[PDB]
Amino acid sequence: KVPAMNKIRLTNNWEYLKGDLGGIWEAVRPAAPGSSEAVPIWQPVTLPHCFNAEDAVDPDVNYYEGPGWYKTLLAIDNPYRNGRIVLDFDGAGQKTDVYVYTTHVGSHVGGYDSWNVDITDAVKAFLGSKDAERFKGKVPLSIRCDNSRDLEMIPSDLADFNIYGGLYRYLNLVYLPEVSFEQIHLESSLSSNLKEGILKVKTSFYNPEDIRKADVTVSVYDVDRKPVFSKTLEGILPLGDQLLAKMKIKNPVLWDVDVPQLYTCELTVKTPDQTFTTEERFGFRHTEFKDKGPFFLNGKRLLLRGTHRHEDHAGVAQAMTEDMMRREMRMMKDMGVNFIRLGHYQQSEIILDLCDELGILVWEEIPWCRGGLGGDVYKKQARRMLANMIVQHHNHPAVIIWGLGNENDWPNDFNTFDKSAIRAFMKELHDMAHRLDDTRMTAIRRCEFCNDIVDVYSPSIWAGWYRGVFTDYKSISEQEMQKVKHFLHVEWGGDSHARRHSEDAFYNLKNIEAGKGGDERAGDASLYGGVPRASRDGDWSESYVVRLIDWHLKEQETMPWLTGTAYWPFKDFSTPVRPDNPVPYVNQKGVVERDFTPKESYYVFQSYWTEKPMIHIYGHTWPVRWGGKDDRKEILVYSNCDEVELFVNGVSQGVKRRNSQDYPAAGLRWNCVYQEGMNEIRAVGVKKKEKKEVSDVIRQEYQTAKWDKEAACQVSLLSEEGDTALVQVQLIDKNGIRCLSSKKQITFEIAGDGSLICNLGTSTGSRKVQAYNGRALIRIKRNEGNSVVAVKSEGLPTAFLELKSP
Amino acid sequence: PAMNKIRLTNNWEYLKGDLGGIWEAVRPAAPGSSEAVPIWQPVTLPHCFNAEDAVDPDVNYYEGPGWYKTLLAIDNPYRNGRIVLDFDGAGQKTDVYVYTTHVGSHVGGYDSWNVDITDAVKAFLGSKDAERFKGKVPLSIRCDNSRDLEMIPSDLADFNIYGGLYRYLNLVYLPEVSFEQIHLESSLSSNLKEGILKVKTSFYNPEDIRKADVTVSVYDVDRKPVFSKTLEGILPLGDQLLAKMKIKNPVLWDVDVPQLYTCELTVKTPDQTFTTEERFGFRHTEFKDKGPFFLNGKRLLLRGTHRHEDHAGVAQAMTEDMMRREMRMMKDMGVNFIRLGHYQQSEIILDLCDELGILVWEEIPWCRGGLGGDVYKKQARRMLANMIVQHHNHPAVIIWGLGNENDWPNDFNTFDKSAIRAFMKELHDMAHRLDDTRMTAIRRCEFCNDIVDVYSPSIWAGWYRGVFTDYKSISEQEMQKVKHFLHVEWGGDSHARRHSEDAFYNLKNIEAGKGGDERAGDASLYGGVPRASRDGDWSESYVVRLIDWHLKEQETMPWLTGTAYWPFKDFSTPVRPDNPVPYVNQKGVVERDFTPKESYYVFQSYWTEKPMIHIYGHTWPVRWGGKDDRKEILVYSNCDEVELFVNGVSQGVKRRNSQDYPAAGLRWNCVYQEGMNEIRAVGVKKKEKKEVSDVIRQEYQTAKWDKEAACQVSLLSEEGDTALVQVQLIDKNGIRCLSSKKQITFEIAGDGSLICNLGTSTGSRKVQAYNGRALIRIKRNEGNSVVAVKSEGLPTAFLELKS
């Protein structure tokens, strides 16, 4: 539950086994070295851990969906007298069973909600047994996690993300005294004029020893951590539910996306044998969706500037650490985000705390995501995960929407599809959300035959990607908003293979018909069939998506009725249904790469959405441009500055004034001659409001030679950093000319002491990857030794590079 | 909805015992074949397995399975409608079959539940098997009241855990769209001058109709409208808030002027117009900390009773007419409060409490034994939720009870106070989550008295413990232990028609000052310390004085919320085989067939204003004592003054004064003449300017009697085909043994039958004498019989009955 300094992340001294054991005895039985019990061999791991850290993006295998085991020897020493030992799971995928020695102590189905197990009694029983001697005072903890495919479990394997397995969020050892808090619910409301706040403090006690009386103190501190309320309830019954306090705050400090400010509620439960303190934060804010209108925060219109995220990261799959999450959420805030839909499931509470602290409003949904509707167990799981999500995240001021599902019109996990049954269950979930928490709105995305059930509705609008042209975005949005009481557009964008650029982003896109919608339908997401569309025919360069995002954002400045939108997603993430993407098994629509490297599109959002002066010439990852000699090449600058001057090789190209509606690049575009060879492009901006000057500089080569078809791979050592070498491949034609438009797939192999830094799900961390402008990079960990790298490409001679260590 | 709701009462058959499988209920069976046994019994519903064997003195009442079957003629008037079986209640575990298909099951004998049988009916009517049933649909129902330690209530309880379809079973036709739940949330402002009503509903919509027009209308006590609104094109799916309204100066519900509002809901589509209604009331209730109870801002002494669902001849299977008569009898006695025994009761009872002005405590049957496993706990949670959800709208209800005597162990080989506390607090929390407008309560579990809102200890002064003159001081000590004290259960047993010249005769060993709580062993007739429950003569004369004392003390207890006497009416219980009426708890002020006892008039004289007057001793034919003894005569009356006449001679006027105990000052000491006497009382009530009178006749006997020597049996009266037979115990000299309590056994051979197994002192074939007398009725069946009368150690006597 909620503790403090008694919460211990169990990260070290774990072992992992892919696959099942024959019974719990195999995890704990005596095993001599070299015996039959000494196989299978387990892998030492540090938690958090995901079964699929590598195989989700490995280009040659289906990611593992099945059982796996973890074991540790727990060093238990409870600092509380007669205290409790609780295992607190931030989240584990998907079905988990927990054992203390040979005793099954808990189970859970659901990969995204938190849950816990009190193991006090099992530990005591184990420690009192003759078997305890062999474990040298420690307690064997064995945990089975299972992400086997299961049609009767949400989410559906039809979904566009990995249904990951393992202990991929922190597992906490929580020591508690005799009496603690099982639940703390802070009900906050804000009066009509916003000058009066009401706080009700409700709690559920955890009291397995049946202590009859306790003294409970409730204290509330303001945003400066000064106390504004304190009350002690003497001799209360600390059992079950208790309302501890009801209080009115005059002139409360409001939580806002620009100034996120939180109050703190500190609860203490005292007996003769304990003093136990924990705290919980909350915020005061008023939210309102206008009928056929926009969104209001604290009585003022706020355009939601949104993104999404999956719990997925390079090298670790779902097993992100707290530091990784803080960096990601800080990157979002620095981009100007004020709204996020947390993918298709409840996310780590670390993320929710960061949204409270950084000022990011939240839509959080259950993973009822495609496939239809299952039987009683499926439904019981959905209800349980909805209730768990609302109960667990109720206090976060960031949350404004509880989502009930995504693309529930997508069939075929069952041999029937019954719209009426889906409506009935959707209404049951909506009713449950309002029964549990009527201060927030319910929502779904893309299920038109349920659009009368939920409070807030999103259709599918992928203008310029899965359908139509992106200049239809505004008109499609105008038509769609009129169909529902509260319209909120979640998911739009396009894929970009990071570091791939184009001199003509529309080269194969000139015959896409406008005026025929922009929704994703069955078959549009696949690589085959359908009608002409950028998702199928586009080059997947960053150059196209930068122009697509630019368009959407400048249109939103002229849509005063719009609640807002959320781009899909913030960061590239792995998906099992896209084996043939330029990075295999990665959805590449992010504006950030899967390893946190910003794409060029990140700066488009930042230039529109932030006030801190910045300036970004497009093409930081574009080393070689091309065209005719003395052709005037378009240069785009993404900046929030009021005026920008561009310099090419030190020669001024003139000052331009920023104007969002002067598309593209908000008027900050130039057409300049590049010299054959290297060029230095510099941009200098001033932001009048800040009286600040900022600059950006890039270097680009310009190639006038035309190229024939790919003929060879040229492989070279580009640079080194310690034990790591960066290898570059360049596709060239029969005359040695760089094939700057090539998308040919390149394969890396290594033999010797080193290893490829591959399976990261990034365009520079993939052992099979489509070229970006005829080039491909990968890093090699040399391991202080010698290796040979081979580079393969279909129909081309294989090339080799030796890597030596000094 | 009366138009759509059909009581299934006729054309049922009943089988005591189990079948080998559903096929036995519906298989072809030729006359004289093996399938033609076992033989079933034609019955009319409602029906209870135990209508006779609960009070039959020679058998344990049946706890086990039994079956019912009927053939249903189905004709749904609604297009594409639903067919639902709606159970008011059935004991205890029920399974429902349409032909061979199991369509529903239920565990819990006291909550309502229903089964949609639409699809099974359709599948049956379309099958080759339908032809042999001639257009009808076979419905077979298994009910089971087998003993079960993992099911509440406990068999340790002082009532029968009855079996069968003992509350109405309704056939309900519905259109496509109907209301599954109607919830009326009412609250009443500080000054009682502003009322708030929220109308919430859950739709039943299996065809997924997307739109409907819904009308909400609220009517007052005359059924005239105070609010009406139509919601056009609403989504009739799941939960919908239909209306929230403020009523200025609402009419308040009160125990003297019970006034109800009615909420009427209509749901219309192009294919249907469906209307149903629900009643509610506005009233403010408050339990004061360490203080009394307030209704609508004024202190109200709760004048309470209890009732079990049990009645002569039918056990739990009471009809609506029987329930109406019983509740009217209570209201006419001055009752303003009832605790509904140990379980949820028929909604007919709740509607009557709303209409008559009787506040209600209703509880789940977690009644003795300890605490069971997961199924047991799930049942208690389910029955609590069902009771609150189903009865939420009744303004009469002020308390949801969570259990009774949960400190009473031995249904399990363990007893864990901490586990009982934990589950009790879970139930308390659930009640407040569902309905924070009412108080929770329990009775007699001291180690849980900090959990609930309102608490009752055990105070049985003058019966199970102590003397009844300790009632007030015990109540004073007990009320200080808890925030809100409310005393439920007190009283004493009286064998109706048994009286005593010395009501306190064998009560010499009973010790005062050491509590009045029933503890382990007190309820038994054996062992334990001296107590009136074991040592008293069980006369009406004792309980009348015990009740009199309690009621006059309550006039001097200004801090008292109130009390509830246990029970209104004698009822059957399996744990008292040796009572004067076997297997009947005889603490009622009314007999099990509705005949008032003398104690009924004690309550009435204290609790009502309508002028009445009742000389004690209407069922006391022969008084006794010495020649020229001055006999005490008590008159129970609410008149201001009463004059008594004995054989036409005035004995003086006396003024009523409750504190002048006993009989509120309306007592005389008069000489009876040997032989017959006529006692007449005339009272006047000044407020009403009304005079009322009562008269009784009593014989007076001066002869002393020896031990019982013989049974003298005679035909006392006859009415049509019925004969009233009287037994009189006499000594060796022929003198009536007016103090005899000896058990009398009746037998009959021939054409007639005993009118026995009623659970009444005049309807029992084994019964203790009342003042040496015993009566029973015989249905002669237009023929000849011989009645035999047996009594231990006495010669058996015989009476011929000719027609």
Ligand code: NA
């Ligand atoms: Na893969």
Ligand code: NA
């Ligand atoms: Na699934």
Ligand code: NA
């Ligand atoms: Na019996």
Ligand code: NA
């Ligand atoms: Na039982």
